[PDB]
Design a protein around this ligand. Structure first.
Ligand code: PLP
Length: 315
């Protein structure tokens, strides 16, 4: 069936009180490998093996949580994995990949360069695993909504807050909502100002290309958003919103204090709409009779030293 697991939907009572609205947190940090990537990437990897067999090699350099998901899936599926990460990568990320039995290569100043290098390593029976832009990834991610429907007792929420990098998760959410007949549920698509290709693309009505962007929200860096994201944004209620690195960092700190979990600034971006109350400015109708769902995407590009740095720099 699938490599991902059903995850908890936690009530956030201090937030619910503060916001005068029910806040639920969808906990993707519980997935094998530590992030929501397990859904999308799990689906891609599973299908690749069903079609191509177990003599393939998975190849990936497309971001920290993608490579972790690929490493995990390759071990579960009994397949070779070739993984590239930037020269200065978090050591536990490296150890996890080695422990899985993947072949780890250290290369590049950032994840874009790791990806560029990884792409050149794909041989005749190798398959490159993208982070976001593939139909299988969207299908995999869409499983989150089927779960949400059950967990919320078929009551459509007032909004779903969804971090956006390349738009894979976004696409699965919107597609899941259409399949669930929740076509009217707004998705708040959150990015940081440092890399806002989705938001910029919606303004332009075409795919904006960005180079050299950086942000603490590593998994949200993308040169462009998927063409599918822009297409779906025309036919479903989507609100693009951007927050600062300082807001995302503060949310990571607050979530660690409140829920005792360390999540990436990527997930912190979505949580920041609640912690800052900006959600109320976006949806002025919110009331204690209404529900908001935050997709807490998890991620492994976070550590105690990140939290030291965030506190010093942004607070
Ligand atoms: C992949 C990911 C996202 C959203 O990514 P897309 O590229 O838009 O699919 C958000 N948070 C984390 C931690 C991720 O790994």
């Amino acid at each position: 069936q699938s490599l991902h697991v059903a995850t908890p939907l936690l009530h956030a009572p201090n937030l619910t009180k503060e916001l005068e609205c029910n806040v639920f947190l969808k906990m993707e940090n519980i997935q094998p490998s530590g992030s929501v990537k397990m859904r999308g990437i799990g689906a891609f990897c599973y299908q690749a093996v069903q079609t191509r067999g177990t003599n393939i090699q998975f190849v990936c350099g497309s971001g920290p949580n993608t490579v972790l998901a690929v490493s995990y899936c390759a071990r579960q599926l009994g397949v070779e994995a070739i993984i590239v990460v930037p020269k200065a990568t978090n050591e536990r990320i490296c150890q996890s990949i080695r422990t899985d039995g993947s072949h780890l290569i250290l290369y590049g100043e950032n994840w874009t360069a790791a990806e560029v290098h990884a792409r050149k390593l794909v041989r005749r029976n190798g398959i490159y695993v993208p982070s976001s832009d593939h139909a299988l990834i969207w299908q995999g991610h869409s499983t989150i909504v089927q779960e949400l429907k059950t967990q919320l007792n078929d009551n459509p929420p007032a909004a779903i807050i969804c971090p956006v990098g390349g738009g894979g998760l976004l696409n699965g959410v919107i597609m899941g909502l259409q399949e669930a007949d929740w076509k009217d549920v707004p998705v708040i698509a959150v990015e940081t100002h440092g890399s806002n290709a989705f938001q910029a693309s919606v303004v332009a009505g075409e795919l904006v290309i960005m180079e050299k962007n950086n942000t603490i929200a590593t998994s949200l860096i993308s040169k462009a958003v998927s063409s599918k994201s822009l297409e779906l944004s025309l036919n479903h209620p989507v609100v693009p919103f951007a927050v600062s690195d300082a807001m995302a960092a503060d949310a990571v700190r607050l979530f660690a204090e409140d829920f005792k979990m360390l999540v990436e600034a990527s997930a912190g971006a979505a949580l920041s709409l609640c912690y800052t109350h900006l959600i109320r400015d976006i949806l002025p109708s919110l009331s204690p009779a209404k529900d908001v769902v935050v997709l807490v995407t998890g991620g492994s590009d976070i550590s105690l030293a990140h939290l030291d740095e965030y506190r010093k720099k942004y607070m």
